[model samples]
Structures are given as structure tokens and as C-alpha cells.
Target chain A: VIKQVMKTKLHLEGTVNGHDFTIEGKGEGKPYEGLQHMKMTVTKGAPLPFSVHILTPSHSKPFNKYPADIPDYHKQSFPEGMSWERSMIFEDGGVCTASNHSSINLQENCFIYDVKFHGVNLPPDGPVMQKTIAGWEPSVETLYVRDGMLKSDTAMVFKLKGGGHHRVDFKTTYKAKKPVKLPEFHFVEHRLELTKHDKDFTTWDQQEAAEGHFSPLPK
Target chain B: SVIKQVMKTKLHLEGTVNGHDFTIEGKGEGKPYEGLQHMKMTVTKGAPLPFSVHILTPSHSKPFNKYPADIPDYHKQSFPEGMSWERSMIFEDGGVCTASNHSSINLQENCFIYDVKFHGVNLPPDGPVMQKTIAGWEPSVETLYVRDGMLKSDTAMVFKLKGGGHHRVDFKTTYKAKKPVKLPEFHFVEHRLELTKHDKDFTTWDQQEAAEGHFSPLPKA
Candidate 1:
């Protein structure tokens, strides 16, 4: 029997760091497994910053029965005939880190993915900067897949100048062959070094970035 | 039947402005059916100083049917005989209006007003505009007024604009009791505005006004 693969497409366009960026890609994988292949190209300004290239020979691995002797071990382990792993990688030192393990399979009409880590690691002195010289660090995102729909919640925190910290929380939901809509991106800036007149250090300031929501083009 | 004067009741409403969540609460002592209450609104941060103002009116000008049909049942209500409420956010972006009736009583099904209005040039481009209304009460515009002790209330509500782009909110209220009501404290929060420049062709008066009115004055010759 030939294995059938389910495929979905996604499109994202937004402005970051005063540059217009776009992501147009598609992913396909077996049911109850993971997206075996996702090819995306990230473009901005005149030149393309990063290009996603999925590796071949990528397949899902079923779990085997393991001894239940450790705490929370069973919860983390997959039951017999359950749990499949799928992973992909990019050439620019970027990787998915782990094969996506399915907490809930599609056979049950519910699909939930856990530990599906994927992100890009630019050069240390690249455009995206943080506390250290490390460029944009890896980000972990939990993906929920269903018929004709996909959703995920993501967050990131990093350091800036003046001992201040910047954190962003965003929730993205997409439908198959539909316009991508990205709601408000919650951005919080924390000033940690302003702990004056305190013995143990309890004074810190936090502020929200004003222009956080993505403004759609005039209809 | 002697019309019983529905005593003023306190109300607290929660809302978000520019992504910041806030709550506005105070008693409704204004007249029944036609007054306004200027509730005290505060941010969730430190001290409860005057951060913003919320205007509450006993009756609304529009009906609830005009509002988005997807409004949750919690926000849908029917007024008691002749009662409704109009809540307005008196924050940075001019004003946004919301009106609803009480749910307990069985007024005319159409009597309930849950419509909302937006008065601003810089309104959000997309996404749902109005938010959920937390509370409502009887229509006692005349009986609504603030008591002593700093909790301001009103009945006759006015959501209007001032010169240029300045917005003004008026609460026509009559306090039931007399006490000290401290006004809102003036403070400054982060305010961001964007300006875009476009290429223009000289000659047309409208084009000249549009360019010259906004751009910096030309340097002296």
C-alpha cells in the first residue's frame, strides 16, 4: 500500500527591524506523523537573508515499549503503536533539533505536536543581536494541526542595551489556502538595572512597545 | 403606580486600551433614563491615580441590534421597562461607545441597545473594534449623580470632539449625596504617532496645502 501524504501551504508578510519580510512555503508529511518537508524562503530588502532547505531521508520513528520506573517518564514516553518522530534540517547551521513527537495522533481526529523544535542560527555578529554576540537564537514552537487549519503560540525573550530586556509573545493561526492574519504581537521591555534605593533589589520597570500589532494594508 | 426611584448602584467595567488592560468603577447616582456617570478608571500598575475616565449613561441613543451579532450572551441584556446604559472609553484615542440593557428584566426585545460607535481618524485598520460590556443598570438619567467621598457619577453623557484633534467628554450627572470627589490626575503615558511623506506635484492649491501644512516651514530665503 502506497503511503498518502497530507500537504498544507502558508504565507506570512510583515515588517521587522524596519524591513519588509515575507515567508511563502509549504509542508507535507504523513498523517499522525510530522511535516516531513517544509521549504520556505525568507526575503527582505534587496537580498534574501535565509533560505530553508529540508534534508532528505527524513522519516518518522515509532516508539517502543519502555520500562515505567521513573517519575513522569510514562507521561513523556509514547505508548505501543503510538508516538512517531519526524525531523528536518537547514544548511545554514539551522536545524529542527528534534523529531516532532506526536502527543495526539490524527487518527483520533485531534493532532498535537510536542517538542517540535525548529529555528535558525545566524552568525554571531549577524543583524539580529541579543545579550551576547549570538545572533537570533533558536525558538521552540508548539504546533497544532487539524483539517484545513493550523495554530501555534510562540514567545521569545532576549537582552538589549542598558541592561534592558525585550520579550515578545505572538499567536499565529492559519487556514489552508487563505490569507494569513497575524494579530497583536505582545512586546514587553523590562529595565532591570534601575533598582535604586533598594537593599535587596526590588525596583524594576517594564513597558509595552507602542506599535505591537500588525497593521493590514488599507482595503 | 408611584414610580419608585431606582437607587444608584455601583458598577465596575474592564477594558483594554492600546494593549493595556484597565478597569473603571464607580457608583451610578445620576438620574434614571437620562444622565451620565463619570467613573474613575485606573491602570493595573502601581497606585490608583487618575489614569483615565469612563463615562456611563443611563440610556443609549442606538439599539443593541446594530452591534455585532457574535457578542457573547454575557454582554446581551434587556432593560427593565425603561433602562439602558452607555459606556464610553475616555482614553487616548478620542472615544469608543458601547450601549447595553439589563438582562434581569423583560423589556421589549428590541429595547436593548448593544450598539457601539467609534470616533477617531486613527482607528485600528482591522480586527474587532468594540469590546465586551461588563455591567449595566436602570434608565434613571435624572436620579443619577455622584455622592461625596471622591467617587464621581453622572447621567447626561456627551462624547464630542474639541478644536483641532482634542477630544472632550461631558458627563451630565446629578449626585445623590454630597462629598469630596477628586478629579482625575493628569499624567503622560507613551504616545506614538506616525507620519508618512509622499511625493507631491506643485501648482494645485490642495496639494500645496497638504504638503506645506504638514511639512516643516521653508527656511527663510
Candidate 2:
């Protein structure tokens, strides 16, 4: 089966409420309490889109515009309607929690996990941090998809081991007019072959699986 | 400063996975890029609760077994054979995902663990189409701080799973010296490692190594 493995991580260096702040993947180890890690699989050439939306105080300027002086991204909903979760981790290792709406949309030939961080708060002490991309992961299958997705739900694992999702694994619905039924197909399948210790078609496959995803996903 | 950079680190992690509260703890220490280090993991609040494992430098274990001819054949290879670390992570019931050809070293500063095998199953095909176990990744230790007699790092790799994409775990670690620790004199640190070796290149420190003040390299391949 034609398969592709991708590992992607984003790191932004900025100031949150005046504190040096960052949002990124937990490489192999863990980072500070405020960061995150994610992973999944996809067919080569296909795109798996995901994103991180940093929300500011509702009263602050929205980052939706450009020439008008805004940032980027769809911004899903209105500043008031869109919710953002806040967490303050200090040297003492205590984390003050708020909340946000993260999503895992399992579409046709796609899978992904998106993150939304709240940089704003009623007190203005939260993370209203600006961003600077640290760059993409260094792997052949890696790239900057306008977006990417993953099997964010809990079912992806067991469903996979039982040889389930055979026709849906790395496949997104084809574009051949909704009228014509797209034949049942598999963009990829569960790597049955083992290599040394990694499953993904062996070490090469495991290497690729993690190249684009593999941050010990958020439980 | 006497330059006792050697350290003992204690780390902790907390995050979400499979939509549940996940946590892990790590205990380790090393001389940063001193060619060797140590790490141990404990799943305090995550899957298969009460789970644990250890990671160590290849220097401590002989990977290829037979030594390079008179230690002569060892120098011809591109890099050393024992560059990768070792693993003994098995399930309480059946199956084992273990290997010794992986590496987790610092590139200048950050930690990168790669060449990992998530679904370590039997290679030669057993029977009944056996599956695999264990989840690991080639993750990078991004946010890190090692100063003021402490070391703090954050990154995420997985364990406890089958095949590949299973648990995207969160593993955060912290380190502090409970007491002054010294480098081993007879083990992996002997002649296997060195700070500098050129005419003017002077490398090798530590309360113990400095006092002994003996430096050398391998003879020939």
C-alpha cells in the first residue's frame, strides 16, 4: 500500500502577559507545563491539516485582518462566542486551569488534532502572547499544509489493531461528483509488517510516523 | 566555580491523552553532552498504572557484542555501533518491544530521541499473525533549562500501545542534585569518552577525573 508518514511541530517564542512564552510539541521528552504534543498517520502526497489559534481578550484587536493590521487564520467564531482556555504554570509546578475547545475531525482520507490557546483573560495576566514560528519538523514527509488533521478520537487505536478502518485509514473521500458513489477503497492500511521494534512497516515507517506526529498526544 | 556540571534530575509531567488526565515522572542525570546519560520513567497517573522503564547510554551496554578486532576494526565504521540506547519495556502479560539500536543525545543543547520502534514485534513472522506493542517517537526536547543547580525539560513521546499511532503522551522532566554526584571512574566514562584530544584541546572535568588527570584515546583499527 502507498503510505506516507509525517511529523510536525510548531514553536512560537513570544511574551505572555510580559513573561517569555512558547507553544509547541513535546519533542521526545516534555517541555514546560504550558506546551503540548500530537501525532497521527496519513497517506503520502495527501495533506493533513491542523492549527493553533491564540485568542486575546475580547476587548483587544482581533488578528483576523492584515492591511487593516491583523494576524492570520479563520478565527472560527466571534471573539465573544469563541472560547479560550487559560493555564498559568509557575516555578512551583502548580497549574491554574481554564478551558478551550480542541477538535479532532476524522474526515475521509484525513486525520488531525487542532489546538486553541487563550492568551487573554479578564485580568490581562493571562497569555496575550505574540508569535514567531520556530520552523517545521525536519523529515522528508514533513510540510506546511494550510492545515492537517488526525484520528483525534479514542477509537482510532483498537479500531486499527483489529484491522478495522481498512478502507478509511489514510483515505479522504474522493472528488468525483457526489452523485457517483466513490468505490470503497483504502488510501493505506495498518502496517502488518514489523521492523525491529517499531510497527510502522519497520524502523523506516516508525521513523516517518513520528517525523510528523508523535508528541505523546493529549490524554 | 569548580565546574561540577554533573547533575541528578527529577522530572514530572501532566497532560491529556485519550481524553483523560495523564501524568509521568522521570529521574535521571548526566554531564550534558558528556557522551553518556541516564533516564527512568514512571507512569504515575496514566495507562497500565504503576508502569516503569529505564533508558541508558550505549556506553553502559555492549550492543554488537564482539569487540572490534583488537579494538582495531572498531574505528573503520562511520560512527560507533553502540550510539543507540537500550530498552526492556515489556507488557505484564505477553509480547516484548525491546532493542538497543536507538539514540537520544543532545544536539549542542536540546534532547532528540529517534530511531524508535513503536510496534516492536517478532521480525521473522511467528504465527497467527501476531501484532505489536510499545509506543515511542523521535521527539525533540524543546523548552529546556539547565542552570542554577537544576535541569528542567519538556517534550512528549509515547509508551504503552500497539502498532504506531496510539497514545500521544506528555512526558515532562525536572532535575536537581540531592547531593554532589561524581562521574564513574571504571565504567563507560573511562577511555570511551573524552572532552578534548587535540594538541591544545583540553577536555575532561569533574572532581574525580580532574584529580586523576589521565587522558588518552583508542589505538588503531
Candidate 3:
């Protein structure tokens, strides 16, 4: 009746932004589409709570913060905005995007990001062509929520195999908690018990539930 | 470069004993008499789908040709047969023959005995209950095939938790499988399951080892 089971094994690295500005296509185009996955979730409440992004192939990023800087090989530089010089950041190097909001956008903003420099976009034209152009998704592994609050709305399954790749499944709420109390329980009530193997490693292998509060109204 | 090594995460329980050859005695309050006996549950690696584990023992009877009540001079111990073979859990300590083919009852009598308590009126008799209950804990592999040759007379015991108490403990029981096959290959079965208390050893993965385990506390007599 107190049988709790926990497990932890994380490896979801980062970088996912297939580049931007697609009037349709043509970087010499074709081989230039990038970002095959980047599903996000960090709900604390609001129509969108801190944020809730699901970018495999969709677009949205352009509210403010323009004039960027991050290019001694780290890519991302804007000098100004709205595709400043024709966009792609500089030829075909910067802005694959990442934000927590500090700034770096044409799009790929996780709140606001602008630096992971492909190492200065690479010498005259070779760190292997800027490592063959950011090579798309090299890292993006997940099992989030280092803290509390996942009131409901959890459909976590992140897989990323190799090459002709697959195992990329994500249904975000991004686990970051703060604003809860919806639809009754929002959703999620799954259980499978036969556990005694340690029971709790950063929120029971990411299946957290069993806590409910906030019910003050009718004054 | 801040280098310091101490990695131990293991729980191994290999398999074999394809059918016919049993022994399960360790009862009530959380049994694990010397770790655990006849305990074979290997889902290779965290199986949330695909299931196979059908054990309901009170010592299965009703002529499987005839000799099965615990064959070996077989039968000669009274006090209500030593309190129905005293060892427990054929659903609450003895209610049938009890000589120990892991102990059985609830006769449907074929396809290896079928419905003992299936849903057991939806468990709560004690604690910990998570329903998906095709018959308790997500059970529904259609016609389950637990891979590795379907153990009917299996055996598993591997414990090592030396000093720091080995992440608390674990326990459970429901013996009996007389003849049921089809569910093998998580590498046929392996075991090294250790759990000590203080100095810490926690181990697994020396060859894809310890899919996950921990269970103890058995001495109710």
C-alpha cells in the first residue's frame, strides 16, 4: 500500500532549429530545411503559461528584442530586425533559435535565446562548412521538472533514434508548475503497482501524481 | 576534471525450469525468506504492455493423470495438514489442499487453471492498488506471452544489500503454474539481485542487467 517505484535515465541533449524564412524554399534550397523536432511544455498558467511550444514544423517568434549579437563562430547576429540584411541571420548560419528570453530571434526562441555560436560560423567557410550547417538536431533529450507542480496534462514520451530516424514523440505540458486547478483534474490517472525498487528519483521516473490542493471560492 | 567513480545499479533474475519442479514456502506479513524463492518475473526492460504471469496456487488438484499434491512420500502431516501447508497466499493463508505446487484452488481446470480470482472483487484488502486490472495491475496481453519459454516450475533468488539497507524493501506471493507455456527470451533469465543496507552497492547493467527489482520481509510464523 506504500509500494513506490522510481527510476531515472536521461540523455535528451539539445539544438533543433532547421533554419528560418521560407517564402516556400531555396537556399540553393532542398537540403536546407532543418529542425525536425522541438516540442515544448512549461505550464504554470495563463492562456500559455510561461510558454508551450510544439515546433516540429510550425512558426511563431517575433514580438520584440531584435538587434542581436553572437557570432565569433557562435552564430546568431541581427544588427537589426525583420530579416535585417535578407535573413538566415547571416547567409545560412545563425538563428536556429533557443529562448528563455535574453534575445535571438528571427525564430527559435525558448523565451529568448541568442547564443550557442556554431563557433563563429566557422573560418572563411570551413569548420567543415560550420559543421555542415548546424547538422539539425544533435541534442534534445527530455524528462523535465526538476521542481514541483504538474497538476494535470501529462503526455510525455520523448524518443529520438538515429539516421533515417524516428522515436520522436512529444505531447507537451513541459512540466514546470505553478498554476493548477482545471477541468477538475485536467487529465491523467494511470497506475501500475508492483514496486519496491527505490521509489522516487526526481518525481518517480516522471509519472508524478497524488497531490491536490487549491479550492477556495464561494465567498 | 573532477573525477570520482561509484556506480552500482543492478537487479538480475535469470530463468530456467520450464515446467514441473516446484517449491514455494515463505509466508505472510511480507515474506522473502532468504531473499525470495521461485520468484520469476522478468519483463526484460520495463514492460508496460505485453504481459504474462498467471499463478494461483493452493496446490492444484483433480487428476493431471493424478500425482500432483506435492509428490514425495507425498501426504502425511496433520494438524489440518500443517495448517494447510502453512506458508500462505493462495489468497489469504490457506483455503485449499496446500502441499505446495506453490499451492492452488479455484478450479477451471485447463489452459493451466484459468480463473482463480481474476479480479478478486477488485483488491484493496490491504493497500497499494493501481487499476488497469484486466485482473490486477494492467494485465491484458490478450493471451500473454512472457517470452523465455514460459516457466511453470521456475526458480529465482539473488539478493545482496549489505550495509545501508538497500533502498528500503519489497514483497509478494501467489504460487502455482503446473503447466503453462509460451513467454520467453529476456535472455532466458538471470539473477544477481543484491541489496545491502549501509556501505552501498546497488548494481545493474554489466550485460544489460537488473531490469528492476526489490522485495523483502517474510516471516509470519
Candidate 4:
């Protein structure tokens, strides 16, 4: 007796080597079991922290060729006949170690997920070239299946030359299709694809590349 | 450009609560739920415990119990037998705001842990948003999260005036359950869980210019 789409958003802001940066965007992911599948965007700061590719000046080349590599995993598990999807991290060499805290208020058809992910050897799959990199992502989310009350405080932080940290307190007061199914994987897939170095070069960068900035190797 | 008072926090973790101190059926003067005796938390104190243990109680006999059809404001003369919100005070060094970082409830042990966040709210109702605020501040807030029956007691209470400078009270509560166990039909009961900290301000503040305060016309939009 219902049909709806669970909506959400992401607000990430922190320091990139002491320089403040902010990215505010929304979420769009349809789901079946508890409104899972959430797809977010990087509206403001393109190429988030721990990303590998850089923009370039070439005509046909905008972003890099390959996305961050998704390292292999032993075996990941979830509650209630649930499981993690393989190849979900990224094409990067680095990995995301996880720690979780969750609650299932069955009487209320409400589920709480206080999940966290720590970045390792970040900017991997071709981008681990930085001096030092460390980061964390903590999500305190609740999905109420009855009258959709998706409450979440998902925050992210990265410590490199300096660090970046920000938290987006999101909630859907209205009845949604479902509670964006308990976030299964970190949004690592939204990193970069290093096929070429191209963003019109007008906004390119060498090592100190800012947003929309990438380095152009020979030719 | 305003600086109000700041809030402080002290939190800790606990696994076992001598909650077995009383029986709901016995206290309520009868079998609480269809002869369904509430399962003992047997709340093990370590490893894979319930992230948070929400206290469910039998209500019919509760002095503090508020009913659907508003009942006469009765006197809550007796306190809920097996309940106490005041855990030992836990203060974290540094940071104006502190919390219980390393605490959890592992379900395997049939126990639960809770994570509560307490941040002070600004004054003037959505007043200044900055961390610091006006001094000589006195703030108080209550924190809780539950799925069912609840009630409380307190009247003729007094908020102490701040001589130690003012501050806001911000807090949080987080709960975890490994395996979603069906919660027992716990009735209602009155209880209290409280913690207080002696917090001195951690931030510095500034005052508006005396000249400007004296007399100034509004600026053009």
C-alpha cells in the first residue's frame, strides 16, 4: 500500500592541507529492503579527498581513465540475512576498514546504523602518491520503515598535510519509500577514473592541484 | 559575532545493572504481561553486548505513568524500583564538550550499550550559533531515546544561578543491538538517569564596541 523514493543529501567540508573546502550535495537511490541503494553527488568539490586522478587541458580528456581500485576482501557480513556486495569499494589499491554500531527496534520497524569507515593508503589505485594520508567516515543513521523518518548524521574527515572534516545532519521528515537501505558500502565509487588528464587544463594542477585541477603528463 | 555560555559533558559505560532488584509483576500487584515474566538482561558487561539497553518497565502501577485518556495528575510518590539514570560521572579531558567514546552493549551477552551526545543549545531560541556565548549562563537539558511506555517526576525544581560563568548544555544518546531481539512487553515505570558536571568555559569572548552601542543608525540594505 505504498510507493515512494527515499531522498537524502551529503555535505562534506574540511581542510585540504589547511585550506578549507566544502561540498554540499543530495542523495538519490531507490531501494527494496529498507530503502538501501543510495547514490550521492559531489556538487561543490569535484574529486573528493584521497582521490587519484587530476584534471587536464586536453579536448577529449576530462577526468582520468580508471576509477579508484576496489581492493579484495575476506568476507563481510550484515544482519538479518544481509550481505555486502563485492567490488563495492573502488578500483583503488587502498581499502576501507569498518567498525559498526547498529540497532533494530523491531516493534517500531526502525533500524539504526552507526557505521564507520577508515581510509587506508588512500588516494590509491594510482593516487597513493601523497606524503601522508588518513581519514574516517562515520554515519549515525536511522531508517523508520513505517512512516519514513530517515535521520542521519553522516560525517567525513581526512588528515593529510592538514585535514578536512565536516558533518551533514540529514533527515526526511516526510514519509519516504524506505530508509535508504542501511548504507552497505562507503561511497568510494565516486572517486576518480584515471583514463586521461583533462579538464580543459584551464583548471588543471601539478601536485598542488586545487578543485577541478589535474596534472598533464607528457603529451 | 556573539559569545554565549558553553556546555560540558561527562559520560561512561556500564554492562550489568542489578536491574533484577525487583519484579514488575510483583510491583504492579499482579503478573505484568500474560504471565510473561520480563527476561532478565543477564546483561553481560563485555564484548558484543547490546549497543544500548533501553529500560522497558511495567506501568499500570507506576505513579509517574501518564495514560492515553488523561488521568488526574497523580502524585509520583515512589521511584521506579530498578532504575537509576545517574551513572558515575565521567569527564573527558580537553574539548569543551565530552562524551562516552568507548562504550557498547554486546547482544551475545544479552546486554546493551548506549552512546549519548550532549551539545549545548544556543540562547534567544536559535540565537547565536557560535560555540561561545554570553557568560553568567546556566543551562540544563534532559536526554533520552525509547520506543515505548515512559513517564517522569519533578516539580518546584530550581536552576542554580551561574557564578562559575554561563554555558549551554548539549548532549547525545546512541544505542546498538547485535541481533535484533524482540523486545519483551515491558510496561511502564518511573525512573531517573542523571549526571551533572562542573564545567568552566573553554573559549574566550569579546564585547561590542562601546561607541557603537552608545548610538548608531541602521545600515542601508
TM-scores across all candidates? 0.20, 0.24, 0.18, 0.19
The order of the candidates by lDDT, greatest first, is: 1, 2, 4, 3
lDDT score, candidate 4? 0.22
Give per-residue lDDT, candidate 3, residue B75. 14
Candidate 2 lDDT by residue in tens digits, B1-221: 11124544343444332233434454555553232344454445544421112111111211111121223111112122213333443332333444333333343433333343222333223311122233222222222223333333232222324332333332233323333332211101111211121112111111111101111121111
Q: Is candidate 2 or candidate 3 better by lDDT?
A: 2
Deviation (Å) of B33 in candidate 3: 38
Q: What fraction of the native alpha-carbon contacts across the interface, defined at 8 angstroms, is recovered by model 4?
A: 0.00
Superposed on the true chain A, the predicted chain A of model 2 yields a TM-score of 0.18
lDDT of 3: 0.18
Worst 10 residues of 2 chain A by lDDT: A165-174
Which is superior by DockQ, 3 or 4? 4
* Top-lDDT candidate index: 1
lDDT of 1 by residue, A164-207 (tens): 22223323333322322222212111111111212311111111
How many residue pairs in model 4 have overlapping backbones?
80
In the order shown, the chain A TM-scores of the predictions are 0.28, 0.18, 0.18, 0.25
Note the Cα lDDT for every prediction shown.
0.25, 0.23, 0.18, 0.22
